[PDB]
Amino acid sequence: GVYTYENEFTSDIPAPKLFKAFVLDADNLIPKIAPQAVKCAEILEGDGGPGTIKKITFGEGSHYGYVKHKIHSIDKVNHTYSYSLIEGDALSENIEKIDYETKLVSAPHGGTIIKTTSKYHTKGDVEIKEEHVKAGKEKAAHLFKLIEGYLKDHPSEYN
């Protein structure tokens, strides 16, 4: 019924330096990459931990709308972050929650590779087109670059 897909991508910053700013600074960096897209991400409980519930509110497009995200488990020692989407305007009652997986890996060349797996659930007949998902993957791969891009800038309080 549902197939899982894994995507690999190489980014700057070491697995650990990116892992922290990827999950520890995600609550603040997530909205930084697309602030006009959402008003602000809030966590009902967990604060970025296991079984944490997140709520995002969109002020653009329809008059109302909000997506919720849930974390399954995080491994700071294994540099692995797993999370899933609970509700969202793009999900609708036809699309069920989606299991998301994030894995940070470093290479001997000095670069850092990041593996992410995604899984979408459906009520039963509601299905999506692989071509549509492939397009979303491209947009996501572009967001990852922005994550390291900001870290590379290294903003100073003096500025």
On whether the CB atoms of residues 22 and 147 are closer than 8 A, the answer is yes
Instruction: Name the residue ranges covered by the structural domains of the chain.
Output: 1-159
Map residue 17 onto helix, strand or coil: helix
Distance CA 159, CA 84 (A): 37
Q: What method did the depositors use to determine the structure? A: NMR
| CB burial string 45-75: b at 16+ within 10 A, e below | eeebeeebebebeeeeeeeeeebbbbbeebe
Distance CA 68, CA 66 (A): 7
Cβ partners under 8 Å of residue 4, min gap 6:
99, 117, 118, 119
Map residue 126 onto helix, strand or coil: coil
CATH number for the 1-159 domain, one of 3.30.420.40, 3.40.50.300, 1.20.1420.20, 3.30.530.20?
3.30.530.20
- Kind of pairing, strands 5-11 and 80-85? unpaired
